[PDB]
Amino acid sequence: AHQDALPRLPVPPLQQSLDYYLKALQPIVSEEEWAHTKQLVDEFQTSGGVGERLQKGLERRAKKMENWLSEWWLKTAYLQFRQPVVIYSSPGVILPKQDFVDLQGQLRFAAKLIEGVLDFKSMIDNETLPVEFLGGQPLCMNQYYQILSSCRVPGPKQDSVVNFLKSKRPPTHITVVHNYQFFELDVYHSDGTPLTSDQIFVQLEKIWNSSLQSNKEPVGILTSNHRNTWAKAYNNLIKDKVNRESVNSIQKSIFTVCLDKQVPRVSDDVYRNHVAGQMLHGGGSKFNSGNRWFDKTLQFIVAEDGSCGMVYEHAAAEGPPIVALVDHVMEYTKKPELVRSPMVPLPMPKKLRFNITPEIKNDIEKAKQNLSIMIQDLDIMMLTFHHFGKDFPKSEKLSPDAFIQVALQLAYYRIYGQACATYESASLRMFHLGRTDTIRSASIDSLAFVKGMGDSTVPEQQKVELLRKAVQAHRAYTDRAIRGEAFDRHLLGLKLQAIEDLVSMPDIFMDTSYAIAMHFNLSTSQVPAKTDCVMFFGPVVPDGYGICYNPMEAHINFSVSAYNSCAETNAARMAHYLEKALLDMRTLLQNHPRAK
Ligand SMILES: C[N+](C)(C)C[C@H](O)CC(=O)O
């Protein structure tokens, strides 16, 4: 019912979107390229022209679909993306490290975590999940019904997603992975009531005792290979009815809990970078990468040393829904303990065995090698910005997110001497089934600021004005994006409509400017959470960075990724300039108060 009250995703006017496109191109293309693109744009949208016909097609699409973009986005952004989901697609999460130092503790926490999720699942199944608002406007809650009991399934041409949340007989079990071995653990009684952390611990107890050794092949590492490869290996792996039975149990499970094995202690100054690696990819074949199933939508990882976190498959959802679950859970794991009545000799969790063959074993070794290369090429720098958080920008009446994005443009320019196409996730949840759109952080105003900031001929009195104008511009772009007025998904739609209409690919899309515009050297997102956590992901281009952050009141958690194969990029350096950019902006604003 709530969804029927939500407005439908609009199709922006053609002229509106193209005008914003031309403006966003100015700081990243040459004068000559911009001029040429201006011509193509005028032609493209002329009355009775090509663009007008494609626009009408989109308007017809919105009239005959719940959300004109949904299917196209899911397919284009994820299902047709054939690179491994590991690092390149599935975001990782680091949660507040826990205190436990022994096995019974780890299982105790793991057990508490499970109960927390089920508590959250209650509102989902019962549809009692509080209605969220952005500011007087209702938000789509569909993403919350895609994360549990779901899984990505390899496809020879494109992948697919399975969701058992609303099936005839919905799954009532989760999968636990310990020492590369999977187990099927039911978390509900025949009566319907879910198990308690105690009963669950008793179950987790039996599971650990039934997997005390690690000498099995890491079948799960197969899910980390190229999708074309995993598609073939998967198809084979499931020929054996036992394997197919296990794989099926995994895909149906409410979610996967990974009880990771102890790993080598590292120096404190690189500890977080390592924990990030463990959450994003596992660390390698001889660590915890095999203790996974990357096709799974929600994977909660409870490490040995007390660290904890997760990694989720992106086709299934976005960050916000994930953090809402994380916040609810991390809080639940802190609640008191009273009624601890004695359970019963609960049934034992079924083990998900795998019959390995020379062919399957070979694919496992091919996967280990592929992942090994991927991990060695990833450069990650985790940065805890302790200087300030949302507090400072708020004290200047500036949007913290906009302040942060402008700082990143400053950091990038200080390193490369030029701006670059920049992507920032914008939530389209105020619309039915809305996912995301793109906020472009490289703008006419941000370029003017970063240039003025380093120009010794520009007085500080002027620099600050340029700073304020850049932040307000980003905030404006952000407000338009969230209200369906950005242009990136729109242009994508026009291109896909052309493909569907069987008409020659419009020149505007073959244009050099468009190519430059869609090559994001900076791919970013803000994932706010009450929980002091942080997410991270790999760059979207060879020569780019993947930056994610969670601004807290007095500090900001940042993650910076880059590829070693590209000499021009360095996570540590980008992180350093970012910290300094943020500091210099504070100094400049402090030096020139609007009043007094
Ligand atoms: C990670 N990144 C920014 C590439 C993708 C976002 O997580 C989702 C989106 O913006 O569609």
Side-chain angles (χ1 to χ4, degrees), residues 244-351:
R244 187 166 60 260
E245 178 184 60
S246 295
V247 168
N248 196 202
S249 184
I250 297 178
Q251 309 188 323
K252 290 193 291 189
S253 61
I254 303 184
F255 61 82
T256 293
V257 182
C258 311
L259 300 177
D260 282 28
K261 68 190 65 55
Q262 176 183 56
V263 299
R265 182 175 179 62
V266 301
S267 57
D268 296 305
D269 66 308
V270 305
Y271 180 64
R272 282 183 71 71
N273 293 350
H274 278 60
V275 176
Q278 175 178 183
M279 301 310 166
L280 189 69
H281 56 245
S285 57
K286 48 186 174 183
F287 295 85
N288 285 291
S289 297
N291 205 53
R292 307 273 190 291
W293 193 267
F294 297 95
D295 284 339
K296 197 63 185 171
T297 301
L298 300 176
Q299 284 189 281
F300 296 81
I301 303 170
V302 182
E304 186 281 310
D305 64 31
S307 298
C308 63
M310 59 191 285
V311 58
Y312 67 94
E313 206 287 308
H314 225 324
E318 304 301 332
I322 296 295
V323 298
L325 174 155
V326 167
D327 287 347
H328 182 291
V329 171
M330 292 308 96
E331 179 184 64
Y332 189 106
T333 65
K334 289 182 172 59
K335 292 183 178 182
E337 301 183 298
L338 299 177
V339 293
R340 299 302 168 183
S341 175
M343 40 58 259
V344 299
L346 300 170
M348 175 175 265
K350 301 179 179 184
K351 181 179 183 179

